[PDB]
Write a protein that binds this ligand. Structure first.
Ligand SMILES: [Ca+2]
Length: 223
């Protein structure tokens, strides 16, 4: 997250870290045994880390659970990043409380102008590299589809939305991928892609979760 603020320990209780020997992507806990992330975060051998703040220090609220199965969306296209969503089943159910909690799925899509919370352990610099060890947060609005398509001609599908600031300075970045965009207490987006981080006229692009609710619910019900 560039231009964000330190969330505070366990203030974003649905945020997960995906770990393969190191943190490589975020995700969101949507019930006691399932996480949603970005398909471009797919790899074998994932450990899901819940209850994290400092990802390099054991602080006492963590739960470390290996994945038992990963399901990339059937129509994911790695070249365009259309349908950039995947589900991860945990080998065992997590223990839910105030510091580790699921986030509700949306019943309706969010409209442009709605303010959302984006979080992650990604890079904090738009030029260069500095990775934080504690979770960072950013409040940002959903932008109009017209402005999103004008910033990224020919690249925005119906399964994507833009959020952030056209003036730059505040954005999600590398290492935030897969993490949540939460608006009015519902998971509306997944950190997906952008042209650099925090550049003028190049806001972040997010997977539009409301289009996938049926696929999520059907997949969970049978796996
Ligand atoms: Ca920790």
């Amino acid at each position: 997250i560039v231009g964000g603020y330190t969330c505070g320990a366990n203030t974003v209780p649905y945020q997960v870290s995906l770990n393969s020997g190191y943190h490589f992507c975020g995700g969101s806990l949507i019930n006691s045994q399932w996480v949603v992330s970005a398909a471009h975060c797919y790899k074998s051998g994932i450990q899901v880390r819940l209850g994290e703040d400092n990802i390099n220090v054991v602080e006492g609220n963590e739960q470390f659970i290996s994945a038992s199965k990963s399901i990339v969306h059937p129509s994911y296209n790695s070249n365009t990043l259309n349908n950039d969503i995947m589900l991860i089943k945990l080998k065992s159910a997590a223990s839910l409380n105030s510091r580790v909690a699921s986030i509700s799925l949306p019943t309706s899509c969010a409209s442009a102008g709605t303010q959302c919370l984006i979080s992650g352990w990604g890079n904090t610099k738009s030029s260069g590299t500095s990775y934080p060890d504690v979770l960072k947060c950013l409040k940002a609005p959903i932008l109009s589809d017209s402005s999103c398509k004008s910033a990224y001609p020919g690249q925005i599908t119906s399964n994507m939305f833009c959020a952030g600031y056209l003036e730059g300075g505040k954005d999600s970045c590398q290492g935030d991928s897969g993490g949540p965009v939460v608006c009015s207490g519902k998971l509306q987006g997944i950190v997906s892609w952008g042209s650099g981080c925090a550049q003028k006229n190049k806001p972040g692009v997010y997977t539009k979760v409301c289009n996938y609710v049926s696929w999520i619910k059907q997949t969970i019900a049978s796996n």
